[PDB]
Amino acid sequence: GSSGSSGGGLTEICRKPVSPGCISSVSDWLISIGLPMYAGTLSTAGFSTLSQVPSLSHTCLQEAGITEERHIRKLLSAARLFKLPPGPEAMSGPSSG
Numbered sequence: 001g002s003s004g005s006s007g008g009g010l011t012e013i014c015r016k017p018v019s020p021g022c023i024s025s026v027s028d029w030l031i032s033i034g035l036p037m038y039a040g041t042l043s044t045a046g047f048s049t050l051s052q053v054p055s056l057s058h059t060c061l062q063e064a065g066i067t068e069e070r071h072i073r074k075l076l077s078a079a080r081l082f083k084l085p086p087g088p089e090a091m092s093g094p095s096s097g
Helices: 026-033 036-045 058-064 069-080
Strands: none
Touching: 026 036, 026 069, 036 058, 058 069
């Protein structure tokens, strides 16, 4: 579910309930860490999927524009702590894992 819209235009009062606490996309994760100031930063670099989040890198952030060794460390650390849920556990390839 994309759940969104194209451009501006608010129809009637939105009034939305507080987040469920669970992360859905990068942003949601960036906010849960207190670094939502990068949401648009990484998103612009291509970071749209939460798959690249847990795969960040000192160079990855540096490419986006992030230099603050204080923020980069937090992001890289927060990403490594991002434990994604398992799937159908079976498919993978020729080599078992």
